[PDB]
Amino acid sequence: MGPVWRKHYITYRINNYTPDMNREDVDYAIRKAFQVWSNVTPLKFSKINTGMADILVVFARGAHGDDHAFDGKGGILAHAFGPGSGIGGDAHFDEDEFWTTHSGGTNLFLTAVHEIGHSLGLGHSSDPKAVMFPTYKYVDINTFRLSADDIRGIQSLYG
Ligand SMILES: CC(C)ON(CC(=O)NO)S(=O)(=O)c1ccc(-c2ccccc2)cc1
Ligand SMILES: [Ca+2]
Ligand SMILES: [Ca+2]
Numbered sequence: 001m002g003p004v005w006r007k008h009y010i011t012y013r014i015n016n017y018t019p020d021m022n023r024e025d026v027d028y029a030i031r032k033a034f035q036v037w038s039n040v041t042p043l044k045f046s047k048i049n050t051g052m053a054d055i056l057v058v059f060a061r062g063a064h065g066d067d068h069a070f071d072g073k074g075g076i077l078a079h080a081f082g083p084g085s086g087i088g089g090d091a092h093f094d095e096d097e098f099w100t101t102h103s104g105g106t107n108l109f110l111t112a113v114h115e116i117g118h119s120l121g122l123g124h125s126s127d128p129k130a131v132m133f134p135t136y137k138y139v140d141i142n143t144f145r146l147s148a149d150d151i152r153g154i155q156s157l158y159g
């Protein structure tokens with residue numbers, strides 16, 4: 001195994017908000033993305049408005065304080081660090097993308113599900129049906145499901 005959180009109670013905080021979307025829509029996309037993983041694990045996620053949080057959610061562009069600069073519009077969409085202190089767990093979204101609640105631009109909810117998978121310790125899948133397969137493609141949000149591979153992976157880490 002790579003690194004895993006050593007507690008099942010995990011906190012998150014949204015550092016800043018993309019101007020591409022309404023604030024309320026960012027909050028909702030992120031909450032629902034955490035819920036996807038909560039639904040198949042003993043993990044419980046709790047939002048912090050101010051102070052220390054395990055998973056910091058950040059929107060930033062270009063070089064933004066870690067060794068992994070974003071690349072402007074297109075290409076890399078986002079990245080996340082595996083479980084750990086400090087930057088460990090943190091999920092970064094490239095502001096040079098256009099984040100949306102729908103099929104236009106790049107869907108924030110779906111991308112966050114993939115990134116939070118990384119924040120929890122998952123690597124990439126070779127199952128094209130898995131959210132951890134490293135190709136972004138819009139599927140509608142109401143019918144989105146984790147694949148059996150995603151579930152096998154996350155349950156192998158927690159529970
Ligand atoms: C390795 C590389 C091809 O993938 N990316 C870097 C990465 O792994 N960050 O997590 S990505 O940013 O392009 C990328 C690609 C796909 C997705 C993705 C996959 C499924 C659903 C939503 C987004 C997110 C980022
Ligand atoms: Ca980019
Ligand atoms: Ca962190």
Ligand SMILES: [Ca+2]
Pocket residue numbers: 018020094095096097098099
């Ligand atoms: Ca943007």
Ligand SMILES: [Zn+2]
Pocket residue numbers: 064066068079092
């Ligand atoms: Zn980063």
Ligand SMILES: [Zn+2]
Pocket residue numbers: 114118124134
């Ligand atoms: Zn990835």
